[PDB]
């Protein structure tokens, strides 16, 4: 019963998932392609309700995306059996260290080799246009594309991803955790049903599970590096104000 409840919590709480992303990325109001600054402003005229630099505008749209995903992950976590029973400070700790690992995992679902869906599926910005931006904004998304290409080569579906994200959140070695024994047992259950699910769902890949353990470690490193870019921007970029929720997450991480 654990696997089904987690998959349903994922379907209930994330506005965007892999099935919906592929349905959009294939056609069937097709996405407006943002490949240069002229198509950027055109998309912003049609979609967004600024005079700031375009890099700062893409920056503020990305963080609003992250704030909304953090809200979705919080509701998702509360639906993980056993999560709500933890001390409130333990739930905060799990979310604080878990959300960006989950975010970059789930971001892979909207990414291909050419770019990524944006604006709740209404736009598609190209990998090259993000590289064409001025430093340091050009260096933010490329490591996430690199991770996503290798992650997407595993060909997970939403049922696999939902259990994987639950395992990320329910991680007993986060700094400052009080009830480490209870959380470790929660994780052991999630990982157990994840392993059974990978065997049933991917019988062709008997090594899928250790592959995914490595992805959890790569994600931790991807987020550690990302947090360093956040601090660079908080210190050295004029108009790049950071959302208070996100600064609280990155603070002391």
């Amino acid at each position: 019963s654990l696997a089904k409840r987690i998959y349903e919590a994922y379907l209930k709480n994330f506005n965007m998932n892999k099935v919906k992303a592929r349905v959009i990325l294939s056609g069937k109001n097709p996405p407006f392609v943002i490949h240069d600054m002229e198509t950027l402003c055109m998309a912003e005229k049609t979609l967004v309700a600024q005079n700031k630099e375009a890099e700062v505008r893409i920056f503020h749209c990305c963080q609003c995306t992250s704030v909304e995903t953090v809200t979705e992950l919080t509701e998702f976590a509360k639906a993980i059996p056993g999560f709500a029973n933890l001390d409130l400070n333990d739930q905060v700790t799990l979310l604080k260290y878990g959300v960006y690992e989950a975010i970059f995992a789930m971001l892979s679902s909207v990414m291909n080799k050419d770019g990524m869906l944006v604006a709740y599926g209404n736009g598609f910005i190209t990998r090259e246009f993000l590289k064409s931006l001025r430093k340091p904004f050009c260096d933010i998304m490329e490591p996430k594309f690199d991770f996503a290409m290798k992650f997407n080569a595993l060909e997970l579906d939403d049922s696999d991803i939902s259990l994987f994200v639950a395992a990320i959140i329910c991680c007993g070695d986060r700094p400052g955790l009080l009830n480490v024994g209870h959380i470790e047992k929660m994780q052991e259950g999630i990982v157990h049903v994840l392993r059974l699910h990978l065997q049933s769902n991917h019988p062709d890949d008997i090594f899928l599970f250790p592959k995914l353990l490595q992805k959890m470690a790569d994600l931790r490193q991807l987020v550690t590096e990302h947090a360093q870019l956040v601090q660079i921007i908080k210190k050295t970029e004029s108009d790049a104000a950071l959302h208070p929720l996100l600064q609280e997450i990155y603070r002391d991480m």
């Binding site: 509360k78 905060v92 979310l95």
Partner: peptide
């Protein structure tokens, strides 16, 4: 409460 706490305390 923190902002994370506020999200977690919502019904």
């Amino acid at each position: 409460p923190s902002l994370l706490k506020k999200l977690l305390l919502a019904p």
